[PDB]
Amino acid sequence: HPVAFRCLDKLGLTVQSVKWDVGKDPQNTQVGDGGMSASQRKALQQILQRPNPTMSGAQLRYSAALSWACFGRMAFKVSVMSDGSVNAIWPLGIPFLKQKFDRYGDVESFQYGDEAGKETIPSFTKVEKNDKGRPIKNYAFMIVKPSINGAMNFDVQNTPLQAIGVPVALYDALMARAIDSADGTPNSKWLVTASRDLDDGQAKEVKEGIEETKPGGDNGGEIIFIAGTDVKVQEMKNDLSDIHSKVPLDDQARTIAGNFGIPIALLYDESRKAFFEDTIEPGYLTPLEDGFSMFLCGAGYRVIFDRDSIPALRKSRADIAATYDKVTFITEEEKREVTGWPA
Amino acid sequence: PAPSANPAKIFIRRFFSAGVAKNVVSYSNVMAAQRAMEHPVAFRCLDKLGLTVQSVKWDVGKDPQNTQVGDGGMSASQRKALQQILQRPNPTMSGAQLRYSAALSWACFGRMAFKVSVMSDGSVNAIWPLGIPFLKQKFDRYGDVESFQYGDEAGKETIPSFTKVEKNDKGRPIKNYAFMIVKPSINGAMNFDVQNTPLQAIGVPVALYDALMARAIDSADGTPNSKWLVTASRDLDDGQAKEVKEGIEETKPGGDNGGEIIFIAGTDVKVQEMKNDLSDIHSKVPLDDQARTIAGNFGIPIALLYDESRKAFFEDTIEPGYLTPLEDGFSMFLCGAGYRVIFDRDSIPALRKSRADIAATYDKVTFITEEEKREVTGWPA
Amino acid sequence: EETKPGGDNGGEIIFIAGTDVKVQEMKNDLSDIHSKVPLDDQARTIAGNFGI
Structure with missing residues (x-):
């Protein structure tokens, strides 16, 4: 459609432009930092910039957000190899x-293929964990979008496609009507008519x-003189200028x-600023980043994306930085x- | 490192089959x-899109997020050759045209x-689209492609x-290979899935446009462009009806008595002026x-x-839909870690004022x- | 008939010798189906x- x-490809595209990196978190009360090895963190950075071969971080982001928009x-x-060091990531x-699901409240395993x-x-x-908490064997995420009635995972999806069936169907119907009427309404004007007294043998001649x-005709652009037997021409309109129902x-x-x-x-x-910092950021950037940070690294460190990498917010950041520079009681x-x- | 077992094996089971050399795009x-x-x-x-990206300038450069102190610039001479080939690809073709063809195919097929x-030591010799x-x-048996067939x-x-491929000790290849950069879509199937192109969703409007334009060309020639449908009576002695005509x-302009009045003595002829609007033949709306x-x-x-609007088209559609996937694809497998292909944004003539201004304001800041x-x-540094 | 676009003699006039046929063009407004206001x-x- x-x-x-x-x-859809707009939403996927914009989020695919953001740059990743692993980093210290601001609300770091955890002095016992969960960057368990500080070598697992380097590997996580590497994979975060280079996922499973023949796939880049950008395409990973694009597919992730696209599925998030379609299905929620x-x-x-x-x-992960053997020591909290992640090897590569697949969507x-x-x-x-x-x-x-388990018996208490949650999922235990994912089946993939029939x-x-x-x-x-x-x-x-x-999953088989480390002495620190990190996994040792493979696993999956299934990040979910909440809804009414809780039901953290047993619930129905929360996607825009829920509430656009009527307009998309209406659009399809209207465009089908337009296409059909485009070819099928005669494009001719001047419905001329004679009477049953004209000797067809000259009604060929009147025609x-x-x-x-016509432009480039024998007598093209000259008048029409009809001596006797008044013929009657009527010009059809054939508006055809609202076939798609513009309104x-x-x-x-x-x-x-x-x-x-x-x-x-x-x-x-x-409006571009609004689209960036009103729906894209707190509807695709924050949920994905919190999902990764929840279980991809220990406390104190988490996946972060540089806001200054958005080409639209650069001027705003610069102005806000300039203004703050003027303040002194800080x-x-x-x-x-x-x-x-950060520091 | 590499585990060789991806979860992409759903499709080789029955949904696909190995050792068949399937084509990449539908004939449709x-x-x-x-x-x-x-x-x-x-x-x-299409040609605007190609032209714009064709404009960007290439170079290989240090990557900013260089956490790999063990730089993958294996030789620092392979990198000079990569620079060379990036400015001069295979003879009888330049880098700009390379970008043009690459982006055009990216737009049309995704x-x-x-x-x-590559000669023998990671030094790439030439690049062909x-x-x-x-x-x-x-495809292989586990989840992915192994070889490309080119020609029937x-x-x-x-x-x-x-x-x-035969990869030199450090990991770099020694013999020829190909890339097949692909665009992601729904339901994964990273390579087995359908294309993702703008052409999927404009068949309806392009067909409607052709219908209207055909109607326009058609009606242009065929509708009489004459006025004054004059008819005399059926009692006029044709021999003077010719005379009235x-x-x-x-x-007419340039006639015997042009511009003077018409005197008819009896047998009233009846003229009616046709409109011949013809001012909406193409249905502008x-x-x-x-x-x-x-x-x-x-x-x-x-x-x-x-x-x-130019700034928006540059930093909203061209860049994160043609520049970043192409550069990330080249970076993924053309050079080792710590180094990758980068293009200078200041080579864009439309962003120069924005860059200058943001540079000016930051200069005023001090806590940085x-x-x-x-x-x-x-x-960079 | x-x-139509892509027709044998498409776009020329219609000549009817005798027995006047009468056409009327349907408006088919259809531009207020949802009652915009x-x-x-x-x-x-x-x-x-x-x-x-």
Whole structure:
């Protein structure tokens, strides 16, 4: 679908532009840092910039966010070698991913494939752990978007596709009507008519008289003289200028574009700022980063992405930094931390 | 390190089959891409997209996130050769045209393919782009591609993939290979899935546009362009009815009595002036909408067909949809860690004012060391 | 019929000798199916009530 695909690849594209890195977390009360080895952290950085071969970090981000938008879930796979050192990461196709629950409240394993592929990959909650807490064998994530009635995983998905069926169907119907009527409505004008008293043998001649005035005709552009037997011409309109129903179409476009959280103007700069820091950041950037930080590294360190890598927010960051520079009742470190710049 | 067992083995079971050399794109997709290159709006947007990225300048450079103190710039001479080949690819083709063809195929099919000729020591000798329509690839047993077939009967060079090839000790290859950069999609299937191109979603508008334009060209020639449908009576002694016709006719510009009145003595002729509007033959309203739609789907602000819009098109559609995947693909397998291919943003003529301003403002700041004020605006060290 | 785009003689006039046939062009407005005015107002009401 044109509009849905446009919005989807837009959302996937923008998030695919952000840059990763592992780093110290700001709310580090945990003096007993969970960066267990500080060599596991370097390897996690490497994999975070270079996932499983023939796949880059950007494409990983793109697929992750795209699945997140379509189904409201994110699934992955890690291959930690033996010592909390992750080997590489794979994204999981949400369509054909099944999961299996425990007796108390949660998932234990994920089944991926029908009959042949049956790798009952353990969940993070149950897997062979280190003496520090880190896993030793493979696992998966299944990041989930909450909904009403709790039901943390047993619940129904929470995706925009829930509430856009009506407008997308309306759009399809209207565009089908337009396509059909484009070819099928005669494109001719001047429905001329004679009477039953004209000796067809010259009504051929009257036709050749009217017809042969086309641009580049024998007598083209000259008048029509009909001596006797008044023939009557009527000009059809053939408006054909609203076949797609322009008004009850842009409304559906605004509906299925707004439901993805896209300021219409995108399809001025202020609206780009809004789309970046209103729906993209706290709807794709924060959930993915909290999902990774929850179980990909110990406390005190977590995956972070540089806000200054967004080309649209550079001017805003620069102005805010400049203004703060003028303040004085504030130490240098908090002037730093209030605008990134950890220490 | 490498575990050789990815979870991508769902598809080789039954959903696919190994040792078959499947082609990479549907014939429908190829023919759609072909005639979309002759359509006015689609070709305009395609060549704009190619032209813009074709503009960026290449170079290899230190990567910023160089946590690998064991730099993968194995030789520092392979890197000079990579610079050379990056500015001068295979003879009879330049780097700019390489970028043009790569990005154009990326836009049309969502795939990129290439070929290298590393001599014996990680020094790549030349780089060739591969025609996506007639490139077929052959998969391994676990989850991935091993070899590429290029040509049906005579050309049968099953060039090895990068994953499986004779790789010099450090890891760098020794013999030729190919890339097959792919665009991600739903339901994973990183290589087994369908293409992801703007052409998927503009068949409807492009067909509607062709329908309207055919109607326009059609009605242009065929609708009489004459006025004054004059008829006399059926009682006029034709022999003077011709005379009245000559009287009316010979008022054309450059005639006997042009511009003077017409006197008819009895037998009232009856003229009626036809409109011949013909001022909506192409249906302007349900045409520019299709132009906007097949323009919006390629990721192009309409206004381009003000400077704020150029900036947006550059740092919103060109960069994170053509520049970063291409550069990350080259970086993944063309050089070792710590080094990768980078392009200078300040080579974009549209961003120069923005860069200068952001550089100026940061200069006013004080609670930031010099190196970070540099790195936040390029300028590595 | 044979004047549709991609027709044998498409775009030329129609000549009917005798027995006047009569065509009428259907308006087919269809541009207010959703009742744009008494719909955006409901959107505003169920929006303003959420305080947005």
